[PDB]
Structure 1
Amino acid sequence: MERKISRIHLVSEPSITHFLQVSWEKTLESGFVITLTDGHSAWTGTVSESEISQEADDMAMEKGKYVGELRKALLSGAGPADVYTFNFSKESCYFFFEKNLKDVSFRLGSFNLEKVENPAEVIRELICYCLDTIAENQAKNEHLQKENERLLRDWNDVQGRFEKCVSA
C-alpha cells in the first residue's frame, strides 16, 4: 500500500490550493484511487487497470510511457520543462488534467469523482497519515544523525591511531 499527496491549483478557482491524494496497492499500473479535497468537501474516485489500458490504447502510446506520464503529472513528478492544467467541474463532478505545451493543450486524463458525504473522516485520515509520516521521518533522521556522529568519532580515533603508528 502506497500513497502520495500533492497540491494543485485548479484553473476554475486560481486562488486556493486543492490537495489530491493518489493511493495504489502495489504499483500505479494496476490502478489507483484519487481523492481531491479543498479542505471542506472531498471527491473520491477510482481507476482500474482496464480503464488505464483503454486510455493508453485510445491515445496510441505504449502503456509504460503513458503510466510514466500519469505518474509525472499526478504524483508531482513534473520536471523543469513541463506544465499541467487540472480542472474539475463540480456541477458535473468531472475532473480532468491536460498537458499545456507551447500554446497547445493535450488531454492527459479524465475521471468522474463522486462527492463523499463525510469529508471530515477523509480529512482526518489524511492529516493522521501526514503526522505519522513526519514522525517516522524525524525518528529515522535522528537515528541516522546519531549513527553519523558515532562513525565520525570512530574515524577520528582510528585516524589518530594510524598517525601514531606511522610515526612510531
Structure 2
Amino acid sequence: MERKISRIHLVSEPSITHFLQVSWEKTLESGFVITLTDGHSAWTGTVSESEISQEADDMAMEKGKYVGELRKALLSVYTFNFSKESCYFFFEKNLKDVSFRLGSFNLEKVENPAEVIRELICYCLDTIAENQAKNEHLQKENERLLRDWNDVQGRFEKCVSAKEALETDLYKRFILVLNEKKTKIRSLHNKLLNA
C-alpha cells in the first residue's frame, strides 16, 4: 500500500485550504481510496481498476495522458469543486480560452473527521523523521567520500609538482652536460676542417 497527501482549494469555497489524500495499492492504476477534508469533516471514496480504466474510455483522453494529467492534477491549470451533501467532486483541465472535463467522483463521506486527520499527521511526522535519519547517514557517508577525495587531491598535487620538478631539473642538467659536449664537438669539427 502506497499513499500521497496534498493541499487544494475548491471554487465552491475560494477563501480556504482543503486537503485531498490519495492512497493506493501498488499503483494508482489498480484503483485507490481517496479522502477530502477541510480540517473538520471526513469525506471518502473507493474507485477501482474496472472503472478507472473506464474513465479513459468514457473520455476522449487516452490512459497515459489522463492518468498523467490526473497525477499532475490530483497528486499536485486544474480546478476542484465539491459539494458536501451530494458528495459530487469534479475537476477539469483549464486551457487558454478553452476548457474540458478531466474527472469526477460521487464520493460518500465518513464518520471520523479525527481519526482521518490523526493518520494524515502521523504519516507526515513519521515520513519527516525517517528522511532526517537518512539525511544524517548520507551526510556522514559522503563527508567520508569528500574528505578522502580532497586528500587524494592533495597527494596528487604533491605528485604532479614532484613530477614537473623532476623533468625540468633533469632536463636542465642534461642540457648543461649535453650542450657542453655539442659545443666542444662543434669547436673541434670546425677546428678539424681547418686543421
TM-score (norm 1): 0.90
Show CA shifts across 1:61-103 (max 9, x none).
3222221111111011xxxxxx011000112111111111123
**In the TM superposition, what is the alpha-carbon distance from 1:29 to its structure 2 partner?**
1.2
- Determine helix, strand or coil for the equivalent of 2:3: strand
* Rg comparison, structure with higher value: 2
Report runs of 4+ in structure 1 exceeding 4 Å deviation. none
The count of corresponding residues between Structure 1 and Structure 2 is 162
Secondary structure of 1:154's counterpart equals helix
How far apart, in 2, do the equivalents of 1:101 and 1:166 lie?
61
Query: Where does structure 2 lack aligned partners over 5 or more consecutive residues?
Result: 162-194
Distance 1:102 1:25 in 2: 35
Deviation per CA, 1:105-156, whole angstroms, max 9, x where unpaired?
A: 3121111211111111111011000011101111111211112221121112
What corresponds to 2:107 in structure 1?
A: 113
In structure 2, what is the Cα distance between the partners aligned to 1:121 and 1:132? 16
Identity percentage over the alignment? 100
Q: Work out whether 1:125 is the aligned partner of 2:119.
A: yes
Aligned equivalents of 2:57, 2:69: Cα separation in 1: 14
Q: 1:11 Cα deviation (Å)?
A: 0.3
Gaps of 5+ in 1: 77-82
Deviations 1:11-69 (A, max 9, x none): 01111110101111111111111111111101010111111122111113322222111
Match of 1:79 in 2: none
Give the stretch that moved more between structures: 31-40 or 95-104: 95-104
